[PDB]
Amino acid sequence: LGSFNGIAAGFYQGNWAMLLTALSSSTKNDILATPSIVTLDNMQATFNVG
Amino acid sequence: QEVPVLTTVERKTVGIKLKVKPQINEGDAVLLEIEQEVS
């Protein structure tokens, strides 16, 4: 129960029972990276972040 | 500051290591092979 998510509905009429179970889950993720630099032609430049 | 890692270990520096090499060419122009980091 500590981990459950969603809904479920308790019902009891004499001998029977039933449990409905459902959930909806979604997740969205975005990123963007724009680096820029200058150097001369023949010599290499390098760049890093993180 | 400077802090040691375990590679028995060695000295490691964390800061703003800005070094360059200036070459004056024309009357007014310069050349700068600079490298640095802000850690």
Side-chain angles (χ1 to χ4, degrees), chain A residues 1-49:
Chain A
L1 279 71
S3 63
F4 181 80
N5 291 317
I7 57 92
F11 181 81
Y12 294 96
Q13 184 64 254
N15 297 115
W16 292 353
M18 72 294 291
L19 275 298
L20 183 61
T21 302
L23 180 60
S24 177
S25 67
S26 296
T27 300
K28 185 174 174 65
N29 293 316
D30 188 358
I31 198 67
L32 187 61
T34 64
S36 63
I37 195 66
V38 294
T39 182
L40 278 70
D41 62 352
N42 292 322
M43 288 77 169
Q44 292 178 357
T46 187
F47 182 80
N48 60 5
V49 174

Side-chain angles (χ1 to χ4, degrees), chain B residues 3-19:
Chain B
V3 69
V5 180
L6 275 66
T7 300
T8 309
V9 296
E10 183 178 2
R11 300 288 182 268
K12 181 60 65 69
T13 62
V14 176
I16 298 91
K17 293 187 292 185
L18 187 283
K19 45 195 222 172

